[PDB]
């Protein structure tokens, strides 16, 4: 029993765009842009749509980089997050009521103000690796157990 989500990272050779989420799940943490996939749309179409909705950017080619499943103990639905990366965007990032975007240098990623799993897989994304991950959380701050592996095909 899992629900599909997307997460898009705008990753350029020396910087990455993250957005500080202002409301909903994960508010108060920096993250990529994404959300729930809708009925009748492909995962990739959902990722492109969520990127525009949350950041104001237009992406053409999106590259699959990872799949991470999240389990929150006591919550029945698993979150099946499909992670994508793009180095080619149009438009300038837009700050809205839902999100505050900011560019970060690759050696200045704000891990202390991100979901804790990001410290595990974000360095794989930075080195252009692809991965499958599973993280079991107790609440929103504690990782109880996890698995993470590099793959050739997402
Ligand atoms: N980096 C990172 N991203 C995560 C984690 N957990 C998690 O759900 N996400 C991402 C996946 C999605 O992009 C987003 C959660 O989706 P969302 O609840 O905001 O979706 P939504 O905007 O479509 O829903 P709604 O509130 O508008 O109805 O956060 C995590 O541990 N790390």
Swiss-Prot record:
Effect of residue 81 to M: Decreased localization to mitochondrion
Protein's recorded name: Oxidized purine nucleoside triphosphate hydrolase
Cofactor comment: Binds 2 Mg(2+) ion per subunit.
Organismal lineage: Eukaryota, Metazoa, Chordata, Craniata, Vertebrata
Annotated InterPro entries: 8ODP, Nudix_hydrolase, NUDIX_hydrolase-like_dom_sf, NUDIX_hydrolase_CS, NUDIX_hydrolase_dom
Known outcome of mutating residue 38 to P: Reduces activity by 97%
Gene: NUDT1
Substitution effect: residue 115 to A: Greatly reduces or abolishes 2-oxo-dATPase and 8-oxo-dGTPase activities
Cofactors that this protein relies on: Mg(2+)
Post-translational changes noted in the entry: The N-terminus is blocked.
Domain of life: Eukaryota
Chain sites annotated for binding 8-oxo-dGMP: 6, 21, 31, 115-118
Annotated binding of Mg(2+) 1, by residue: 34, 54, 98
Subunit-structure text: Monomer.
Family: Belongs to the Nudix hydrolase family.
Effect of residue 45 to P: Loss of activity
Organism in which the protein naturally occurs: Homo sapiens
Effect in UniProt of substituting residue 150 to A: Reduces 2-oxo-dATPase and 8-oxo-dGTPase activities and increases thermolability
Annotated Gene Ontology cellular component terms: cytoplasm; cytosol; mitochondrial matrix; mitochondrion; nucleus
SUPFAM superfamilies with a match to the protein in the record: Nudix (SSF55811)
């Amino acid at each position: 029993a899992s629900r599909l989500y997307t997460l898009v990272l705008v990753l350029q050779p020396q910087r990455v765009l993250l957005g500080m989420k202002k409301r909903g799940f994960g508010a108060g943490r920096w993250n990529g842009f994404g959300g729930k996939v809708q009925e009748g749309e492909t995962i990739e179409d959902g990722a492109r749509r969520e990127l525009q909705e949350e950041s104001g950017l237009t992406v053409d080619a999106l590259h699959k980089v990872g799949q991470i499943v999240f389990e929150f103990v006591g919550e029945p639905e698993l979150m099946d997050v499909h992670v994508f990366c793009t180095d080619s965007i149009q438009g300038t990032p837009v700050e809205s009521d839902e999100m505050r975007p900011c560019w970060f240098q690759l050696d200045q990623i704000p891990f202390k103000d991100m979901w804790p799993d990001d410290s595990y897989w974000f360095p794989l994304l930075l080195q252009k690796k692809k991965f499958h991950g599973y993280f079991k959380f107790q609440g929103q701050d504690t990782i109880l157990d996890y698995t993470l592996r590099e793959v050739d095909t997402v």
